[PDB]
Each structure stands twice: as C-alpha cells, then as structure tokens.
C-alpha cells in the first residue's frame, strides 16, 4: 500500500468518464494501440496473457490510433482483420511485418498483398477494406480518440474512468502492474 500505485501520476482519474460496455461483474479495459507502435509491439504479449488470464472477469477491447492520416489504413486494416475473423491469425505477422520486416503496410495493396502470404484472400481483405461497415467503426475510433482524451499509445482505459500507459508509468511492466491494480480495486468497489 506504501508501494501502491499513486493516483495522478501512475494513472490518470478522468475528468468525464465514459459509459462503460459491459455488464454490472465485468471490468471493462480497453487498450488504444497503433501497429507501428514499438512499446504496442512490445506490451502484446503481456497484454495477451494478462486478458486470458482474466476470463470473464473482464470485458477487453482494442482500438486503434491513426495519429495521422497516412496512418488511417492501419486503422482500416485492424477493422478488416476483425471483420474476416482472422485477427488472432494474423496479428502477429503484421506487427512483425512492421516492426522486424520494416514493412509499414501504409496501402490497401501493400496489406492485401502481405496478407496474401498468410491465406487470407485478396478480394476478400479489399472488399472489408472498403466496406460501408469498416468505415463507420474507423470514424467511430476517431471519436473514441477524442472522448477518451488519448494523446500517446498504449493507453489503457479501465472502467471507462481511469487511464495508464507508459506515459504514465515508465515502464511496460509498471503499466501492467497499475492495470492489474484497477481493475481489483473496481471490483472491490474502491474506484
């Protein structure tokens, strides 16, 4: 407790809460990341376990950061990846792409033809790319951004009140411990 995580420096009370999708007995988390985010890369793995770990404690969820406009594809390309159901497939290959490969995966064909390698099929990845329904959720992280006043990724959100980060922490693991520390003390009915 002397060794706690100190609110207003290793995590962020905010100032309009947002409403929370998840049913009263699960904590909802939310992680904001972009995939050409070396400390996103880095922190996956750790996240992965820590959300299993959890089970139906916990209601997780990913949304991703186009910072910039060039970086909006990667935001379609997310959105896509979900709407094949092939995320969890090939996830991996795509922040290895990026991160070990230096291929930043910036066009609809440099993805389609990346993914290719890893079965998915071209016109199929194209037409999630472009659909109606993509786009809508791409505008909706957008907006995501801005009610959750995210500045720098990874940010995780839990409970739809309380921010942390390595912006926040310093350190990956120091981000993992003050999220595993949020959402017990939501659970406990202290935050």
């Known amino acids: ?48 376990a820590w959300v299993k770990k959890q089970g139906d404690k916990i209601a997780f969820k990913r949304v991703p950061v186009a910072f910039r406009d060039d970086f909006v594809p990667h935001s379609k390309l997310f959105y896509a990846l979900a709407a094949l159901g092939v995320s ?28 290719a390698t890893q079965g998915v099929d071209k016109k199929k990845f194209l037409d999630a790319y472009n659909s109606f329904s993509v786009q809508g959720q791409v505008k909706q ?15 995780i959100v839990v409970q739809g009140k309380y921010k942390t980060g390595p912006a926040y922490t310093n350190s990956l693991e120091g981000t993992a411990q003050v999220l595993d520390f949020l959402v017990k003390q939501v659970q406990d009915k202290k935050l």
């Open 141 to 155: 992280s957008a907006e995501l951004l801005k009610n959750y006043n995210i500045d720098g990724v990874p940010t």
């Open 88 to 115: 969890e497939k090939v996830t991996p290959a795509v922040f290895n792409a990026i991160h070990k490969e230096k291929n930043y995966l910036l066009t609809p064909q440099a993805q389609a033809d990346f993914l």
């Open 1 to 48: 407790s002397p060794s706690a995580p100190v609110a207003g420096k290793d995590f962020e009370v905010m100032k309009s809460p947002q409403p929370v999708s998840a049913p009263a007995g699960k904590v909802e988390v939310i992680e904001f990341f972009w995939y050409g985010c070396p400390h996103c890369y880095e922190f996956e793995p750790t996240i992965e």
